[PDB]
Design a protein around this ligand. Structure first.
Ligand SMILES: *[C@@]12=NC3=[C]C([C])=C([C])[C]=C3N([C][C]([O])[C]([O])[C]([O])[C]OP([O])([O])=O)C1=NC(=O)[N]C2=O
Length: 107
C-alpha cells in the first residue's frame, strides 16, 4: 500500500505536478492544495530536521534517497512516511523530474 508523486525539477523548488489518488486520500489535501507546491507542506513540529536535510542534499545532488519522516495530515494528525525519491534524467545527464513513493508506515 503506497502512493506516488512527481516533482518537476526544471522549476527551482521541485513543485509537485502529479499525485496518485492515494496521496490525496492519505494526506487529506486536494489537488488545489497540492499541485504547484513543494511536498514540505506535509512537515511539521516533530519532523526530524536531520532527515529533512538528507533529502535536501540528495535532491541538490540529483541522487536517490530514502528517509523516514513524520508528516501531518490536513487535519493535523501525524503519520510516519517512508519516502523514497528517485531522479529521472534526460539523456544529457540533467535531472528533469523527481518521483516519489510514499508509504504510511505507522502500522
Ligand atoms: C514528500 N515527498 C516528496 C516527493 C518528491 C518527489 C520530492 C522531490 C520531495 C518530497 N518531499 C520533500 C520536500 O519536497 C523537500 O525535498 C524536503 O523537505 C527537503 O528540502 P527543504 O528545502 O525543505 O529542506 C516530501 N516531503 C514530505 O514531508 N513528505 C513527502 O511525502
Amino acid at each position: 500500500r503506497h502512493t506516488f508523486v512527481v516533482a518537476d525539477a526544471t522549476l527551482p523548488d521541485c513543485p509537485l505536478v502529479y499525485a496518485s489518488e492515494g496521496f490525496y486520500a492519505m494526506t487529506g489535501y486536494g489537488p488545489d492544495e497540492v499541485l504547484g507546491h513543494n511536498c514540505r507542506f506535509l512537515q511539521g513540529e516533530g519532523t526530524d530536521p536531520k532527515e529533512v536535510q538528507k533529502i535536501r542534499d540528495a535532491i541538490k545532488k540529483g541522487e536517490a534517497c530514502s528517509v523516514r519522516l513524520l508528516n501531518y495530515r490536513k487535519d493535523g494528525t501525524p503519520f510516519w512516511n517512508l519516502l523514497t525519491v528517485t531522479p529521472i534524467k534526460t539523456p544529457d545527464g540533467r535531472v528533469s523530474k523527481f518521483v516519489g513513493v510514499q508509504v504510511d508506515v505507522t502500522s
